[PDB]
Amino acid sequence: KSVTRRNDIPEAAASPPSLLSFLRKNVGKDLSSIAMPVTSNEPISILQLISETFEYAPLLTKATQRPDPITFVSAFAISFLSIYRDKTRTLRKPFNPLLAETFELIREDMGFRLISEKVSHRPPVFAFFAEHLDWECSYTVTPSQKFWGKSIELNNEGILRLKFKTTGELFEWTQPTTILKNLIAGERYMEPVNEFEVHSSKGDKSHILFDKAGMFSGRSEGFKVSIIPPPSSNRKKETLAGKWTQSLANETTHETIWEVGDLVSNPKKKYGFTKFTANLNEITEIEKGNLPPTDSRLRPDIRAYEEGNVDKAEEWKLKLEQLQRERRNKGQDVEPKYFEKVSKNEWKYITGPKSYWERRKKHDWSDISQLW
């Protein structure tokens, strides 16, 4: 089966507030558990944003069918940055999910399904588990930001663990650091920095290094990828090149490996969302009547905001956070249901008759309370 999607969202209802305003105005001790106005947000939660890591999942599927899978895993690993190609996307942030808030994403068109949940509030910890017939990926991430003085260091702390269900081979990597520049003057934007690597359980390793731009060619967008197989295996060295804002190719044969999809129409007036982004908060035939009470698609503030009601959304954002606060203080902390801690910084999808997907088949959410 298949479903129809909006591939669009209403235009932004308010202009973007300044981030540096909050920084200096809120230095004192130091941010984190400091609230921000709803207008500083884009119409999706962090759970949904991280889900965009899978916009180009077909790359992983193709990887399971190529003698040199790491080159495609490397394309996928870098692909997520493309959502920041239209600078507008860097002007706002996702809504902060409530503890135990969830987000499921089933893309039958791409043959995969994903389930995610906020497993911790302080520090904030998000757990993801994506599934496809030929692969699966788990992720325990903690987004961290650090005011560097004239810019902000953005890092998703955590290892993405990819697994080929075809052969059981494993791939791991941490998403690369990004820097939000032009906090002072000029139009804000983000660009990746330094480098990161994708390591294979079979020894193969991929090294990605982003070009540098400190004061001239504006935003950095190019990058090189050096594939390095284990000297011993029949596999051999390869090289890739491209721009995380457009595409990646095998630089030896100059063949395109990955390309960006489409942004929504008139992106500058719609947070710079890609079409995939715009489809994240839509309730289609897939979700209709199948969601637990905690999915991000059911949040009132995000919904009202998406539909343009600033005041109404602001009312709701304050309400949701206040309620979580009271539950917290009463010690009636809502505990995550679909992931369990396996170690420090590591959560794992709970399997069984009480797992997410099993409960879903029979709408078994009797023990699940409304968070708002």
Residues that bind ligand PIF (CB under 6 A): 31-36, 46, 93, 96, 143, 145, 152, 154, 156, 321, 324-325
Question: Nearest distance from residue 191's CB to ligand PIF, in Å?
Answer: 13
- The answer to whether the annotation marks 323 as part of a ligand binding site is yes
For ligand PIF, the closer CB: 36 or 209: 36
Q: Min. distance of Cβ 199 from ligand PIF in angstroms? A: 22
Name which of 32 and 217 has its Cβ closer to ligand PIF: 32
Q: Which of 171, 175, 136, 138 is nearest to 155 (CA)?
A: 175
Q: Which amino acid is at 329?
A: N
In terms of CB distance, is 143 or 292 closer to ligand PIF?
A: 143
Q: 63 vs 334, which CB is nearer to ligand PIF?
A: 334
Shortest Cβ distance from residue 90 to ligand PIF (Å)?
8
- The response to whether 50 counts as a known ligand-binding position is no
Distance CA 6, CA 230 (A): 45
CB nearer ligand PIF, residue 259 or residue 321: 321
Nearer to ligand PIF, 186 or 231 (CB): 186
Q: How far is the CB of 186 from ligand PIF (least distance, A)?
A: 17
302 marked among binding-site residues: no
The candidate with the shortest Cα–Cα distance to 291, out of 174, 37, 117, is 117
**Residue 41 CB, nearest approach to ligand PIF (Å):** 7
Please report how close the Cβ of residue 336 comes to ligand PIF at its closest, in angstroms: 15
Q: How many residues does the chain have?
A: 372
Those residues whose C-beta lies under 8 Å from the C-beta of residue 30, and which sit 6 or more positions away, are none
311 backbone dihedrals φ, ψ, rounded to 5°: -55, -55
Please tell me the distance from the alpha carbon of residue 202 to that of residue 170, in angstroms, as a whole number: 8
Is 35 annotated for ligand binding? yes
- Give the list of residues 6+ apart from residue 35 with CB closer than 8 angstroms, or none: 321
The conformation of residue 336, written as its DSSP 8-state character, comes to P
Amino acid at 216: F
Q: Is 195 annotated as contributing to ligand binding?
A: no
Instruction: State yes or no: 36 annotated in a binding site.
Output: yes
Per the annotation, does 325 bind a ligand?
yes
Binding site annotation covers 297?
no
* Element of type H or E holding 361: helix 356-361
Has 321 been labeled as part of a binding site?
yes
Closest to ligand PIF by CB, 48 or 156: 156
What is the C-alpha separation between 152 and 20, in angstroms, rounded? 10
Q: Residue with CB nearest ligand PIF?
A: 96
- Cα–Cα–Cα angle for 283, 37, 16, rounded to 5 degrees: 85
Cα(236)–Cα(234) distance, integer angstroms: 7
Helix (H, G, I), strand (E, B) or coil at 271: coil
Count CB atoms within 10 A of the CB of residue 254.
8
Measured from the CB of residue 312, what is the shortest distance to ligand PIF in angstroms? 17
Annotated binding site: 33-36, 93, 121-122, 321-325
